[PDB]
Give the backbone structure.
Amino acid sequence: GTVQEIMIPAGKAGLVIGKGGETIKQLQERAGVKMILIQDGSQNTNVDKPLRIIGDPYKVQQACEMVMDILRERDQGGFGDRNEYGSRIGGGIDVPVPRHSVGVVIGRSGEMIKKIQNDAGVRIQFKQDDGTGPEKIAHIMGPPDRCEHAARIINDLLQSLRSG
């Protein structure tokens, strides 16, 4: 398959690997590609690590883009994977929403989720969710600022549902 390599310097470990694998999870799930990078402590433990993104061409394309961004390290957080698309919908943020909340986000016919698109000026894409079970990625398509603006509404809904 298509494999492009990016180099992860020490100090970006919490970004790309997630200090163990936290990020690589989402790089596999959220991006939908298998990223195999030397996390072997016998060779490249402290030294820079080559990220081998394995996947379909357009996937590695979008992933290579995000890898270069979250690895920049603005706050040694790197978002976590990327939180936006990852091969799927290049344009807008990706949104893992809890299974007890996703149906409420929609509504009955979509009263709620249609007003999200009305309020923030966004589009929704239910993409192949990160295969874990609990959360389901509802992608928010649109301009970056409005993307996050939409996730702040959804996240508040989650907290509303947390308030019995």
